[PDB]
């Protein structure tokens with residue numbers, strides 16, 4: 637699990653500091669606001685719409701992250717496709733013993 | 736030119752179920768008692784169909 | 786599959802927008818870079834510096850909102 641955690645940490649760190657470039661060729665540095673402006677051009681909105689109201693966009697991003705981490709420390713069925721898989725495997729082996 | 740083309744795709748199939756005792760033994764009592772010794776085949780089969 | 790790969794990168798310093806006379810100027814398709822002597826506009830994938838004109842730049846707002854505005858001149862073919 638530590639190797640997979642290292643992989644995902646490297647992936648998030650590359651995304652936050654390089655952008656879309658470290659999958660095509662090498663890694664090219666860019667500030668995060670200019671990267672978000674390029675992605676805004678990607679969805680069809682001009683760069684200024686990011687640039688005059690960058691602060692409320694950052695606030696909305698931070699609030700959405702904080703709302704996800706709240707909802708994870710709550711009831712089950714969020715991760716229900718994984719747990720079910722685990723259960724199925726265990727169940728099969730139990731049958732093979734009782735049989 | 737403007738052209739409209741059709742494409743057909745299957746989505747689901749029929750849901751089925753089986754009574755293990757009725758298929759194997761029918762109405763016989765002796766067969767049912769002998770079938771009790773073959774444990775955990777009919778449950779493992781109904782679970783897959785469900 | 787034949788594919789295009791970028792090869793040799795180079796560092797520049799950049800700004801989100803430039804301010805000519807009380808107006809913010811944003812690039813159309815490219816980034817503003819500082820060559821070392823002058824400020825140019827260039828496409829991201831290949832380095833081809835272009836002189837900043839009114840053609841490849843658009844205007845929006847005043848120079849008191851954007852973080853990282855700089856002072857530079859926008860050429861007009863007139």
Ligand SMILES: *[C@@H]1O[C@H](CO)[C@@H](O)[C@H](O)[C@H]1NC(C)=O
Pocket residue numbers: 794795796
């Ligand atoms: C300049 O580019 C080189 C690679 O070409 C890089 O190692 C170096 O960190 C860059 N300079 C700065 C100040 O980041």
Ligand SMILES: *[C@@H]1O[C@H](CO)[C@@H](O)[C@H](O)[C@H]1NC(C)=O
Pocket residue numbers: 820821822823
């Ligand atoms: C851009 O910079 C290079 C070296 O930094 C210089 O030789 C060149 O003259 C500059 N471009 C212009 C248009 O002056």
